[PDB]
Design a protein around this ligand. Structure first.
Ligand code: HEM
Ligand SMILES: [Ca+2]
Ligand SMILES: [Ca+2]
Length: 337
């Protein structure tokens, strides 16, 4: 079928997504940038989708509808869940965009995440399926993992939703393009790695460094010491990098950086369709832009050495990496407005 601006798609019902693409790229994402709005949009895909629990369903309780737009339609309820702190900003920005284009909240949330991530240097090109219904119910509370949850708790929660430990690690490649706002509000915008617009392996490297710094006046719930000026570290990321259930796969994205994009893409296709049947949706994947940027060689930060890495994979040593020359420059906070 013929879409706008000389574009085409096998399925006429994908054509609307080209118009949503143009709008969110030019406006929400300020000209195709991998900045704040993209980071928030990518986080939102998880906070919508993870509200899904077969365990609750089998005990005769509502388990959540997964990737169903519930966090948006029922934003009054869901954004007041503790685990959903700092989410309403992006939800209230996206809501009128989805309404104006008359696309479903669930589809829009996943679309904004897929388009957004494709703008990041070396980013993924996530599968995009359309057709999720708005008719659903608010997610139960306590289904979103928290940064102070144990690795046992996180893996069990993610396992219930459908993800193996390796897949949890893959999904956390998202933290390569990511900052915090609510754990330590005064340090809003301090990112989880040195390259928050580059979909690279620096997150996996830098979380394995020894925690040495309290960046603000104190530590806060869900935070641990960071290894570099300007960086923020989550307690969960630190535990996951070191825990024997996950440490080898954590290190695998450093030993084999080319695997990060394909494994993230596969895990995200799954997460974006929680509570849905793909065979009853339509495939509009071709609307997602092709990402640009080569796979980067992960490097140790300036002034750090291999002694600063807390290597945690029993079966295989940490890979030999180059070390950046000179002294370390504080990592810039992510802009936002
Ligand atoms: C597995 C357990 C996870 C935990 C405990 C966790 C925890 C967190 C926390 C505490 C923040 C900072 C929130 C704030 O204070 O502003 C954050 C940010 C973020 N999360 Fe995760 N997360 C998890 C998994 C994921 C997944 C699966 C995704 C998506 C694939 C994701 C995407 C993001 C992104 C893109 C940000 C940055 C948001 C921004 O820049 O404002 N996270 N996460
Ligand atoms: Ca949901
Ligand atoms: Ca990065």
């Amino acid at each position: 079928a013929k879409c706008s601006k000389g574009r085409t798609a096998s399925n006429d019902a994908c054509c609307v997504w080209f118009d949503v693409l143009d709008d969110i790229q030019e406006n929400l994402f300020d000209g195709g940038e991998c900045g704040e709005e993209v980071h928030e949009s990518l986080r939102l895909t998880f906070h919508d989708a993870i509200g899904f629990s077969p365990a609750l369903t089998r005990q005769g309780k509502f388990g959540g509808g997964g990737a169903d737009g519930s966090i948006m339609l029922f934003s009054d309820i869901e954004t007041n869940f503790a685990a959903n702190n700092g989410v309403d900003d992006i939800v209230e920005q996206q809501k009128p965009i989805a309404i104006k284009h008359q696309v479903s909240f669930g589809d829009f949330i996943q679309f904004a995440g897929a388009v957004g991530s494709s703008n990041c240097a070396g980013g993924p090109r996530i599968q995009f399926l359309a057709g999720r219904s708005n008719v659903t119910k608010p997610s139960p509370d306590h289904l979103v993992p928290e940064p102070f949850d144990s690795v046992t708790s996180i893996l069990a929660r993610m396992g219930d939703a459908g993800f193996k430990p390796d897949e949890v690690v893959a999904l956390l490649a998202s933290h390569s393009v990511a900052a915090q706002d609510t754990i330590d509000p005064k340090l809003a915008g301090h990112p989880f790695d040195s390259t928050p617009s580059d979909f690279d392996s620096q997150f996996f490297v830098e979380t394995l460094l020894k925690g040495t710094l309290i960046p603000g006046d104190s530590l806060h719930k869900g935070q641990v010491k960071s290894p570099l000026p300007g960086e923020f570290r989550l307690q969960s990321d630190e535990l996951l990098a070191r825990d024997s259930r996950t440490s080898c796969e954590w290190q695998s994205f450093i030993s084999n950086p080319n695997s990060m994009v394909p494994k993230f893409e596969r895990a995200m296709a799954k997460m974006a369709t929680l509570g849905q049947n793909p065979k009853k949706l339509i495939d509009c994947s071709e609307v997602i832009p092709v990402p640009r940027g080569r796979v980067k060689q992960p490097t140790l930060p300036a002034g750090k050495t291999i002694k600063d890495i807390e290597a945690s994979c029993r079966k295989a040593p940490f890979p030999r990496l180059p070390t950046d020359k000179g002294t370390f420059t504080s990592i810039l906070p992510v802009p936002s407005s």
